[PDB]
Short mmCIF file of C-alpha atoms and ligand atoms in Angstrom, two decimals:
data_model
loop_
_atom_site.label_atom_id
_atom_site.label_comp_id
_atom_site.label_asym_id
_atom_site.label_seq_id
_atom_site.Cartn_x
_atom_site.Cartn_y
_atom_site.Cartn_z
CA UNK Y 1 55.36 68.00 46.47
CA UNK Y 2 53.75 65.18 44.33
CA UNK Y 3 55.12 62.98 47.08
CA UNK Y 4 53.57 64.71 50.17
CA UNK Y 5 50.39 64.90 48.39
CA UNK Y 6 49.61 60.99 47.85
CA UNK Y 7 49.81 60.50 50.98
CA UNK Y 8 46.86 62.86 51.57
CA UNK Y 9 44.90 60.42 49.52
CA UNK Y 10 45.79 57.46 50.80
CA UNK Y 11 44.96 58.69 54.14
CA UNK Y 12 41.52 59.93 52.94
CA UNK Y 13 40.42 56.42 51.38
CA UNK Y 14 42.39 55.15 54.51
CA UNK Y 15 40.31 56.76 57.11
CA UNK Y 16 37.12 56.42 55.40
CA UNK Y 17 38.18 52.30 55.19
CA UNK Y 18 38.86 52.08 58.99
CA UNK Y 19 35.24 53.73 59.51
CA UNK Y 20 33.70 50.73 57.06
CA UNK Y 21 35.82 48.53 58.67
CA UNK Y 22 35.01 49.44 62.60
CA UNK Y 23 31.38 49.84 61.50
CA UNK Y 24 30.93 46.35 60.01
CA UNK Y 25 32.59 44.59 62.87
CA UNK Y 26 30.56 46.18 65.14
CA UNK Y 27 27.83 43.61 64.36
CA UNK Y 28 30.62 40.42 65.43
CA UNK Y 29 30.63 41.96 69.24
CA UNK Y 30 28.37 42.23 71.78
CA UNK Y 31 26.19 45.34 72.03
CA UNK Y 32 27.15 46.10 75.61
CA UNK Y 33 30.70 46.15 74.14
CA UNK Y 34 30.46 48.45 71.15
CA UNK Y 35 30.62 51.86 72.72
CA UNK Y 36 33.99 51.95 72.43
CA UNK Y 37 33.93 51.13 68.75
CA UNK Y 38 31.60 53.89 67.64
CA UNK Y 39 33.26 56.14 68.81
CA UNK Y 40 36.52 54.76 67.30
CA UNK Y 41 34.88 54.65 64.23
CA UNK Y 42 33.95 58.44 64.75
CA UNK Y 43 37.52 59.35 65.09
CA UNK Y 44 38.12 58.14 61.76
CA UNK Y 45 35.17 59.89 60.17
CA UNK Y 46 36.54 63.12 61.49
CA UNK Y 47 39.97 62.05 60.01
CA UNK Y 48 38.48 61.39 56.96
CA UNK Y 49 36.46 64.74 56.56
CA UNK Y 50 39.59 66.61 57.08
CA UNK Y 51 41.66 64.70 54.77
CA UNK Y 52 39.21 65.37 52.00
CA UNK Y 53 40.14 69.02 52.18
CA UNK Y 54 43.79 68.35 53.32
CA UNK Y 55 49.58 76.90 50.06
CA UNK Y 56 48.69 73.78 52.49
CA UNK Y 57 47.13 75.20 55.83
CA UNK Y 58 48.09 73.23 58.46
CA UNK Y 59 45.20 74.53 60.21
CA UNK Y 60 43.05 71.69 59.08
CA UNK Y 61 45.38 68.99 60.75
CA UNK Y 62 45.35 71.02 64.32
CA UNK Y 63 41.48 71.40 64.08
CA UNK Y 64 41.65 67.40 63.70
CA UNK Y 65 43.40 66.59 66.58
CA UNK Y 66 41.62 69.19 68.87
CA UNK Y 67 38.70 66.80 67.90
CA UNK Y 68 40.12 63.77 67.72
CA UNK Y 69 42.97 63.33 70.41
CA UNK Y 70 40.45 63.89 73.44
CA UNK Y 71 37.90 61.17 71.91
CA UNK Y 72 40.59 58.89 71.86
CA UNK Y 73 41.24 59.36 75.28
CA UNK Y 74 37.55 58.75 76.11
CA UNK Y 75 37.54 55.24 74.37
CA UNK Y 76 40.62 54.64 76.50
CA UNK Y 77 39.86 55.65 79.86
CA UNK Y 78 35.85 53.80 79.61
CA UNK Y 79 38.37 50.74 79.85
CA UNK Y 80 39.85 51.85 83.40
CA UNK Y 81 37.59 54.55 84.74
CA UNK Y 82 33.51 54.45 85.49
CA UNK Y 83 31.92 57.03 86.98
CA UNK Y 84 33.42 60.02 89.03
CA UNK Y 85 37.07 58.53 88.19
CA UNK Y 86 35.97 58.88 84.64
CA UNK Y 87 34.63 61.89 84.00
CA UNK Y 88 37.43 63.43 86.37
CA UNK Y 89 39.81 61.86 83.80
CA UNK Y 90 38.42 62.78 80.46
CA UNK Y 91 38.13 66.38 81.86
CA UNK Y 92 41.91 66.29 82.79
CA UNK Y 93 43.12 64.61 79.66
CA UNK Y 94 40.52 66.85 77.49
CA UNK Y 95 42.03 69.78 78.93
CA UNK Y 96 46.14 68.76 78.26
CA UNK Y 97 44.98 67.46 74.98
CA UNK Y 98 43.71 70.97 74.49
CA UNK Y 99 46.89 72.79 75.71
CA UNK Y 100 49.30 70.49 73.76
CA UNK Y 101 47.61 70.68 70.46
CA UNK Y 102 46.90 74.40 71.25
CA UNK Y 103 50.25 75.09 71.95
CA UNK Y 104 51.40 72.97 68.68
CA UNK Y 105 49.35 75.10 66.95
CA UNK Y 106 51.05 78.05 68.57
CA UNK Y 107 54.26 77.31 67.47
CA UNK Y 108 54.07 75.47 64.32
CA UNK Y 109 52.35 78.60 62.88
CA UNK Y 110 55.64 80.95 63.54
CA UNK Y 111 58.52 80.36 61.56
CA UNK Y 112 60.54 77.79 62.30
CA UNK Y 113 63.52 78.41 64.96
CA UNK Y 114 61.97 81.06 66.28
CA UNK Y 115 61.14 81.70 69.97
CA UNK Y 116 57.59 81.00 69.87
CA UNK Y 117 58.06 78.28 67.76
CA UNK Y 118 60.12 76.27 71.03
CA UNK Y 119 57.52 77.83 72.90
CA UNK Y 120 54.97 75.61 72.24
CA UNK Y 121 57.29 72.65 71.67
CA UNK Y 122 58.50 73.51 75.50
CA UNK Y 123 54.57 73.53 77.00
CA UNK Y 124 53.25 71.11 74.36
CA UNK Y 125 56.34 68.47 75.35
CA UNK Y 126 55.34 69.31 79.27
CA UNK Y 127 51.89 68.18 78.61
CA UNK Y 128 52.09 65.17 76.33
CA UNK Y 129 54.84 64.35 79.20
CA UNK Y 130 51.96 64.41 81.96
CA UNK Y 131 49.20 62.62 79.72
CA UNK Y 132 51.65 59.65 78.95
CA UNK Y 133 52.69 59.26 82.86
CA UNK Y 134 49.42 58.92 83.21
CA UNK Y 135 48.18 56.74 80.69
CA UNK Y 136 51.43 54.12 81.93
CA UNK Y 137 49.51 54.27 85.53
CA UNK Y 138 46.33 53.25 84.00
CA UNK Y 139 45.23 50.15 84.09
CA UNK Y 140 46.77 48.40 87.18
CA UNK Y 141 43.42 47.21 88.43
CA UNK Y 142 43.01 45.12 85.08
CA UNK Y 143 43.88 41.60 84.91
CA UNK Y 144 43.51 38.56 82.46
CA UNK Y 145 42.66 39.29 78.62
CA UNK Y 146 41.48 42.94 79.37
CA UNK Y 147 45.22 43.66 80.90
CA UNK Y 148 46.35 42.18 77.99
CA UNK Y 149 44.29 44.18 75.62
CA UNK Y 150 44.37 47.15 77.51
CA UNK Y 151 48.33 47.20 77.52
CA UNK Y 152 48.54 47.42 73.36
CA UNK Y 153 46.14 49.73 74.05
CA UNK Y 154 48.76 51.30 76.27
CA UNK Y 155 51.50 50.68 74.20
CA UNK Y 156 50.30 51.82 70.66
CA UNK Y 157 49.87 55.44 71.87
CA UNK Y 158 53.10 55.84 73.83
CA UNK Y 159 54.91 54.77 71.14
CA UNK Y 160 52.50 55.94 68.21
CA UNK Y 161 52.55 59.15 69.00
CA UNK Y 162 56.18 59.71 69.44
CA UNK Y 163 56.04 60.52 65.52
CA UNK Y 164 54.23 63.67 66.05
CA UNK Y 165 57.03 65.61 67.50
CA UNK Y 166 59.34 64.37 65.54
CA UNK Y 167 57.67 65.70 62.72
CA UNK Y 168 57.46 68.91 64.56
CA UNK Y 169 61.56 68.88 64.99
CA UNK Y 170 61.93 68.29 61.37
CA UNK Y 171 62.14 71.32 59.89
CA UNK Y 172 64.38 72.71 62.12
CA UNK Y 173 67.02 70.10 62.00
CA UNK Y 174 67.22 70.23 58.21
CA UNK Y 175 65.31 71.16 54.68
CA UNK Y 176 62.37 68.56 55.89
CA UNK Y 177 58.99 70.84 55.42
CA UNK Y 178 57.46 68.09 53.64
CA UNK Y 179 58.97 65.07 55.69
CA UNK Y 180 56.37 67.16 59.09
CA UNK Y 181 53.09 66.37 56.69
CA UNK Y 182 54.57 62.83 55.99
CA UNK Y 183 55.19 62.04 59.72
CA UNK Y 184 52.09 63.09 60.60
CA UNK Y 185 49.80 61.30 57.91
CA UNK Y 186 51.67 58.27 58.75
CA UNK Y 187 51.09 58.84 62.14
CA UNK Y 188 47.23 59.68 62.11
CA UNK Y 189 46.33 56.62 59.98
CA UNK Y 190 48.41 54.33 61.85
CA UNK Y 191 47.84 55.45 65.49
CA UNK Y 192 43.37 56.38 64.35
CA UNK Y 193 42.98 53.42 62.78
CA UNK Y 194 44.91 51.28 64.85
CA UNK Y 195 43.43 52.20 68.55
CA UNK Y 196 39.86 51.89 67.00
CA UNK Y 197 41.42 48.02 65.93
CA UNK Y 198 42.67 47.50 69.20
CA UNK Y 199 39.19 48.79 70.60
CA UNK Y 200 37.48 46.65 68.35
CA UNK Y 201 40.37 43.65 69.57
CA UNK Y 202 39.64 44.87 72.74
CA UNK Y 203 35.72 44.57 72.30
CA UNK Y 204 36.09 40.80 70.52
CA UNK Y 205 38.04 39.91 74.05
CA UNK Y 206 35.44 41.44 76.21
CA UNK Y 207 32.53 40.29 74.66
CA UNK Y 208 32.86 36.75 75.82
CA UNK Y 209 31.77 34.23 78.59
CA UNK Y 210 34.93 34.17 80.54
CA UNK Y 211 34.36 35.40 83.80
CA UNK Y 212 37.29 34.18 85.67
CA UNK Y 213 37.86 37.77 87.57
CA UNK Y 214 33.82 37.81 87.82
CA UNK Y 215 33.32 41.22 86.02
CA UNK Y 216 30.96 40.43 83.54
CA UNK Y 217 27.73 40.64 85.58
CA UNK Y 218 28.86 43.40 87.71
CA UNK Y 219 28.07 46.82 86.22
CA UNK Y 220 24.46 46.01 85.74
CA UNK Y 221 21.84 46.57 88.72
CA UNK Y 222 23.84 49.48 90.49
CA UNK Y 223 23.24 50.75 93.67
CA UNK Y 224 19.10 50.96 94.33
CA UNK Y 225 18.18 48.26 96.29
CA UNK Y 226 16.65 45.48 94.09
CA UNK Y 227 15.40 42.27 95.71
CA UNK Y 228 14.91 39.50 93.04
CA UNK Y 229 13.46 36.03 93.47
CA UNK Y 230 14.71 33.51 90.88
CA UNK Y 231 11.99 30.25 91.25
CA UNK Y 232 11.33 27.35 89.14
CA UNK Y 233 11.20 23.70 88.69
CA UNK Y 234 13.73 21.81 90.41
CA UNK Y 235 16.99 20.69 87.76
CA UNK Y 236 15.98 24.12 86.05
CA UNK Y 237 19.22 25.21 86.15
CA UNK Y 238 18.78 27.97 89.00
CA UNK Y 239 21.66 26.80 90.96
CA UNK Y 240 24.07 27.55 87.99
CA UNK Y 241 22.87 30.42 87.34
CA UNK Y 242 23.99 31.92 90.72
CA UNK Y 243 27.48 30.27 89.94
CA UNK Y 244 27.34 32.10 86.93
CA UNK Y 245 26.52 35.58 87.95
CA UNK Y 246 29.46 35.46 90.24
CA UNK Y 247 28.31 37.85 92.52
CA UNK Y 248 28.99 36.44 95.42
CA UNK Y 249 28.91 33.59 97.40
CA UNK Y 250 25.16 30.96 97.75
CA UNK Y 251 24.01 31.02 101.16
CA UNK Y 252 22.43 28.03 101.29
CA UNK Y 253 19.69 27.60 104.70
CA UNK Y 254 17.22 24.94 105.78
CA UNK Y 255 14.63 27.04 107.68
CA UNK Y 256 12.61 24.06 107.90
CA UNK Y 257 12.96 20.33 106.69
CA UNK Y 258 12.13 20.09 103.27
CA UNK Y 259 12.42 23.69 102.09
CA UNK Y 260 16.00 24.51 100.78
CA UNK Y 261 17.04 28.47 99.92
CA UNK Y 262 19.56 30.09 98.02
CA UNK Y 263 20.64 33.33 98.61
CA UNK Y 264 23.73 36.03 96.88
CA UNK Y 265 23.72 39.26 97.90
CA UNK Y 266 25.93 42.03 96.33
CA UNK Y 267 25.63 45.24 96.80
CA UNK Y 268 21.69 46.46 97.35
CA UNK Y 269 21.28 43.72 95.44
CA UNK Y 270 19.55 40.23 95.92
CA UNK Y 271 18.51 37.00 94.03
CA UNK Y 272 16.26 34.36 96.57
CA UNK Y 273 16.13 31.04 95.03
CA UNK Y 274 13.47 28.18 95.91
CA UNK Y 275 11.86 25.04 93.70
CA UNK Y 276 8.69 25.59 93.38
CA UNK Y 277 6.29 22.37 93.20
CA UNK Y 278 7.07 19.55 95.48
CA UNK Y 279 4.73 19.09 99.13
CA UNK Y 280 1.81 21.43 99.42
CA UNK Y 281 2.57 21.73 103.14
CA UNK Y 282 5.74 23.52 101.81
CA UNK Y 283 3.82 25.64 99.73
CA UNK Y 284 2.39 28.46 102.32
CA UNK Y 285 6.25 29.32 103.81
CA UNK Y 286 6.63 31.11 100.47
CA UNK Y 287 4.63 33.57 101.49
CA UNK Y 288 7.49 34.81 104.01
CA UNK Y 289 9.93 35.95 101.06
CA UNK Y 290 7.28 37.85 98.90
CA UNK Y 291 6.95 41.41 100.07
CA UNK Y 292 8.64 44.52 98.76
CA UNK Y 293 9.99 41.60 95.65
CA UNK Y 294 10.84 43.96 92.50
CA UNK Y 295 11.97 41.46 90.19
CA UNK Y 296 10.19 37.86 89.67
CA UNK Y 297 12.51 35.60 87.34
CA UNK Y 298 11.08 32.31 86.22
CA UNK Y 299 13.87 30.05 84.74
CA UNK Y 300 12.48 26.62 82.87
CA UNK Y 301 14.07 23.36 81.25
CA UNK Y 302 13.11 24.15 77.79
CA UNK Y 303 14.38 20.71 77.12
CA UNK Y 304 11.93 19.23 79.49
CA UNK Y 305 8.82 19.07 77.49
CA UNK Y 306 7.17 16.53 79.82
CA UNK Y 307 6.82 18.73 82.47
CA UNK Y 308 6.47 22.28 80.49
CA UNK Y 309 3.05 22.36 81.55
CA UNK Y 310 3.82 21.56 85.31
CA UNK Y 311 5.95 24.98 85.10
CA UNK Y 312 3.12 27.29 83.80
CA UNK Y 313 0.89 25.79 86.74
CA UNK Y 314 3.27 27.18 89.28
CA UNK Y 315 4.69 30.44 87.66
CA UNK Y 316 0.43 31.25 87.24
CA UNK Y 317 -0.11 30.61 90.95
CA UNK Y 318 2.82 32.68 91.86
CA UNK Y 319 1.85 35.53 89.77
CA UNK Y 320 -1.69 35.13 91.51
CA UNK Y 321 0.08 36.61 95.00
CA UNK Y 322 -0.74 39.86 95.85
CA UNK Y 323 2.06 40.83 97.10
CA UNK Y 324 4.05 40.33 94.00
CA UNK Y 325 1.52 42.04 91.85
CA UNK Y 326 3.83 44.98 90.75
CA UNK Y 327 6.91 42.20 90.08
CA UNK Y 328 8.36 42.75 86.73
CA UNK Y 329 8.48 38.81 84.98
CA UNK Y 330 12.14 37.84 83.45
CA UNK Y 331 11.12 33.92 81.96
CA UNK Y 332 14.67 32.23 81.36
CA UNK Y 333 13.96 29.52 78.31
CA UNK Y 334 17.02 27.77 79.76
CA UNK Y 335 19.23 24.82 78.50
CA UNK Y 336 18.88 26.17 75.11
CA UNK Y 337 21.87 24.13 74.05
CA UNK Y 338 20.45 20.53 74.48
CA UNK Y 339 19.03 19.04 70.80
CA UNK Y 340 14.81 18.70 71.88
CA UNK Y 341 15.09 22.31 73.25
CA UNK Y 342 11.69 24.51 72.88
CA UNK Y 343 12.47 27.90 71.46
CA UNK Y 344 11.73 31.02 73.10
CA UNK Y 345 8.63 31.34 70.89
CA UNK Y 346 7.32 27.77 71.76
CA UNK Y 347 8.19 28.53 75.50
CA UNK Y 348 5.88 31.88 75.36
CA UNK Y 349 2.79 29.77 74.03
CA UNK Y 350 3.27 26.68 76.21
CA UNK Y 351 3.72 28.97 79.24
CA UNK Y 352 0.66 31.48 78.23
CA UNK Y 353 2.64 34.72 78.88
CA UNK Y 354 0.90 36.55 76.35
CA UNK Y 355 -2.55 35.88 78.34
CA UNK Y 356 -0.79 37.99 81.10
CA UNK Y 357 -2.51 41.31 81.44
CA UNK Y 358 -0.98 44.27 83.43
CA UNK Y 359 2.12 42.42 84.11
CA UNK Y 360 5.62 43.74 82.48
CA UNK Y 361 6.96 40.43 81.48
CA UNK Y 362 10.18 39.22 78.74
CA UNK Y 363 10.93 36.15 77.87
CA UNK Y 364 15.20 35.41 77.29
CA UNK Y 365 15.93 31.83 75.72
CA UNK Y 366 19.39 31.11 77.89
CA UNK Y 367 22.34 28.82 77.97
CA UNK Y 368 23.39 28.82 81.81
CA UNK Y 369 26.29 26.24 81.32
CA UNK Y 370 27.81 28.60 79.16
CA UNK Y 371 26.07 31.55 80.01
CA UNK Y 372 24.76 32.79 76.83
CA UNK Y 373 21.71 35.25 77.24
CA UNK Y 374 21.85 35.38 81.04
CA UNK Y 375 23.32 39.00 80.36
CA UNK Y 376 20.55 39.78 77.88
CA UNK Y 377 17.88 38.83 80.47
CA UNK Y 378 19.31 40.52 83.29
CA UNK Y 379 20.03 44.08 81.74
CA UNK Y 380 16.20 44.41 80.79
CA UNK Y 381 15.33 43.51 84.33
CA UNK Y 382 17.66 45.90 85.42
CA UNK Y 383 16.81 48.40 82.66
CA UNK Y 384 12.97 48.07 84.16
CA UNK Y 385 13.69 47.91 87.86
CA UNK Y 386 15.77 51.22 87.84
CA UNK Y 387 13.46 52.98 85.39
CA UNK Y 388 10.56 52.59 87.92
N1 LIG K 1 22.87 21.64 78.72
C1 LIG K 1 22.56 22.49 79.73
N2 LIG K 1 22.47 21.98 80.99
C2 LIG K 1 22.17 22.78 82.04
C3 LIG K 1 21.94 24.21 81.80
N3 LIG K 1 21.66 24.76 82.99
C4 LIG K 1 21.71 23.77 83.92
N4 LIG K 1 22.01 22.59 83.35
C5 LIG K 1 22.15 21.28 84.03
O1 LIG K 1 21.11 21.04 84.97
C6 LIG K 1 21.63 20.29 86.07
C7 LIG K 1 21.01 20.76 87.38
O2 LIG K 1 20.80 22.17 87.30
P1 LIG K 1 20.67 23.06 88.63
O3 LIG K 1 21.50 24.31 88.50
O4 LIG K 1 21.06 22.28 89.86
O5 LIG K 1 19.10 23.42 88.64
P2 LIG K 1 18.32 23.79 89.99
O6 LIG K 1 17.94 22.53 90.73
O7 LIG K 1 17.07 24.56 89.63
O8 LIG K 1 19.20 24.63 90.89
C8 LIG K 1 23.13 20.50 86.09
O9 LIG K 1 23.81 19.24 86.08
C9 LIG K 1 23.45 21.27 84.83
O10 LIG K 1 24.49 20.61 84.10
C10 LIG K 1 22.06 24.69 80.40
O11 LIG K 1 21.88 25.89 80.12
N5 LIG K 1 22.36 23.79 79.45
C1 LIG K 2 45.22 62.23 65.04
C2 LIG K 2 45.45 62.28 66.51
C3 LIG K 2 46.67 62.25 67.08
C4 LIG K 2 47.07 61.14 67.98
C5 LIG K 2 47.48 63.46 67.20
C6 LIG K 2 48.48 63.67 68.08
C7 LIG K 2 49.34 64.83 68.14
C8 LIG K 2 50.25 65.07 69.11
C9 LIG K 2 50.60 64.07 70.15
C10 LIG K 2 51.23 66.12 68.88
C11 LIG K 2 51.77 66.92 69.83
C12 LIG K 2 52.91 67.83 69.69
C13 LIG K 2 54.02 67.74 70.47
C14 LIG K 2 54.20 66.70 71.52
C15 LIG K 2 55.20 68.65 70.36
C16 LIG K 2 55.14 69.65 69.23
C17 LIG K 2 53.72 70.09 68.96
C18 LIG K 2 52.79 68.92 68.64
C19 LIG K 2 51.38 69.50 68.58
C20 LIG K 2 53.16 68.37 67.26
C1 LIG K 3 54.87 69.22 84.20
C2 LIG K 3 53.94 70.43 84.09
C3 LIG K 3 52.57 70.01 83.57
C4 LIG K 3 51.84 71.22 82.99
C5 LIG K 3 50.35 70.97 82.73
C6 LIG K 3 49.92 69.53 82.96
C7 LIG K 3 48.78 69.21 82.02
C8 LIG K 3 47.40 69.27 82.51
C9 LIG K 3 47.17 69.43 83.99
C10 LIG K 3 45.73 69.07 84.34
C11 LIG K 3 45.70 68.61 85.79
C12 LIG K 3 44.28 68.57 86.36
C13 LIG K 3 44.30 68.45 87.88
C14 LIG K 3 45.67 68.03 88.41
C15 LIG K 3 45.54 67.07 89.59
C16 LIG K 3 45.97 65.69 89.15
O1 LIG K 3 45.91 65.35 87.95
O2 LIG K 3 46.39 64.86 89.99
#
């Protein structure tokens, strides 16, 4: 009795602490890679309003797990599933989540031993038999640190959650009415606040330059087609960009002597990638890779503050075409990284972009060695190019 009900606090402040804690290290990832974290954190704010209230009605626990147990399986399958796959899954799972706590609910309510009370351990075993066959399957397309992450991921629920029908068996196999609460508050703060941990491990591991497996850059631009041209000075760093997107492989051509272009294509997707400067003779074969252009980025050496005024000069006379009057402007401030490096505020006023009028234009100070802000610069581009 006064044993079964400190846990109940502990569990309260314990929940509540695993919201505070998700919540402020939500600020140490990226924000593409906090999704998963809010919504971890949410699980615990449900535990913890339900603890607060939790002659015991057991009621209160079932109507946190109806809640809880499906959201848990939507921060686990956005690690494995996307689109059609995903919402297919989180329906399925939703709906044996449903039937397992329902049918918990269905027994644990009769007395104990009776034949309703093995009726829903029977159904409610069947299904959390089917969702952890599946959860094992997930996954198998993951490699590196997110197969790594993903697996305790894996691991912490098919083992967590073992507890809760054990807890159900208990007092059947013996005087244990109060050992079922312990189980279970045991269970909920350890398996809540651990996934939304191991989200938030998972989130620290994903938010991160390493690209090895080339995933990073992927599930931006979708599937409109979007040509981009990606100019600048020469040594700008546009070359390493298109390394770094690692979206396919640079097409390099020489349509005539003296004019070098770079081209990845993936999906509808394009980048085009010239110097600009150099012989004016070279100049007017520009003019054959402007039409139907959606996205104009403009990457300069912020480090190169001899030749910061050379770079306006050309990215003005570009923006003078016609034919790329409707291109939205993404200005790369790259090699952030070197010591004399212009800011991205310095870069705006040496470069004039606030003189630009009718022109949809952002300015992202970059690192392309390490990649830093490429991703930044890219999802507004994208945000404005499919928004249009
Ligand atoms: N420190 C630093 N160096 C960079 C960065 N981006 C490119 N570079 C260097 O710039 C040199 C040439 O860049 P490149 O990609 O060929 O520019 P491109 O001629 O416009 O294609 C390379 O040796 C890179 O090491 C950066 O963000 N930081
Ligand atoms: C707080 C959220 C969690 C992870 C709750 C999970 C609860 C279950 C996995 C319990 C299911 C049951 C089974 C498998 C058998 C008897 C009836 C139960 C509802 C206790
Ligand atoms: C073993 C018996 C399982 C009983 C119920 C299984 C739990 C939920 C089933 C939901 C299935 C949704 C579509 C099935 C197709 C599929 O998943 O491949």
């Amino acid at each position: 009795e006064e044993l079964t009900y400190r846990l109940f606090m502990v569990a309260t402040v314990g929940m509540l602490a695993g919201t505070v804690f998700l919540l402020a290290s939500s600020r140490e990832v990226k924000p593409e890679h906090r999704r998963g974290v809010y919504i971890s954190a949410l699980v615990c704010g449900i535990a913890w309003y339900h603890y607060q209230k939790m002659s015991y009605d057991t009621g209160l626990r079932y109507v946190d797990w109806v809640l809880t147990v499906p959201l848990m399986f939507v921060e686990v399958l956005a690690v494995t599933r996307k689109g059609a796959a995903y919402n297919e899954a989180v329906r399925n799972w939703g709906i044996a989540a449903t039937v397992m706590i329902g049918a918990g609910y269905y027994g644990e309510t009769s007395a104990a031993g009776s034949n309703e009370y093995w009726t829903g351990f029977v159904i409610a075993m069947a299904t959390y038999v089917w969702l952890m066959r599946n959860l094992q399957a997930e996954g198998e397309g993951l490699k590196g640190d997110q197969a790594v992450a993903f697996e305790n991921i894996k691991n912490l629920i098919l083992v967590g959650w073992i507890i809760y029908p054990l807890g159900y068996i208990a007092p059947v196999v013996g005087d244990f009415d109060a050992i079922r609460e312990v189980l279970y508050t045991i269970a909920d703060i350890i398996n809540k606040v651990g996934l939304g941990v191991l989200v938030l491990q998972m989130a620290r591991v994903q938010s991160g330059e390493g690209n090895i497996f080339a995933n990073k850059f992927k599930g931006l631009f979708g599937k409109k087609e979007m040509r981009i041209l990606m100019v600048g000075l020469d040594a700008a760093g546009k070359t390493t960009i298109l390394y770094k997107l690692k979206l396919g492989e640079i097409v390099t051509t020489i349509p005539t002597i003296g004019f070098n272009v770079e081209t990845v294509e993936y999906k509808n997707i394009s980048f085009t990638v010239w110097d600009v400067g150099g012989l004016d003779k070279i100049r007017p074969l520009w003019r054959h890779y402007f039409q139907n252009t959606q996205g104009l980025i403009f990457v300069v050496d912020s480090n190169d503050r001899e030749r910061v005024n050379e770079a306006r000069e050309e990215l003005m006379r570009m923006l003078a075409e016609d034919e790329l009057r409707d291109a939205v402007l993404l200005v790369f401030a790259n090699k952030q990284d070197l010591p004399n490096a212009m800011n991205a505020a310095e870069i705006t006023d040496k470069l004039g972009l606030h003189s630009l009028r009718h022109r949809n234009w952002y300015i992202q100070a970059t690192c392309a060695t390490s990649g830093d802000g490429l991703y930044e610069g890219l999802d507004w581009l994208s945000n404005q190019l499919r928004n249009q």
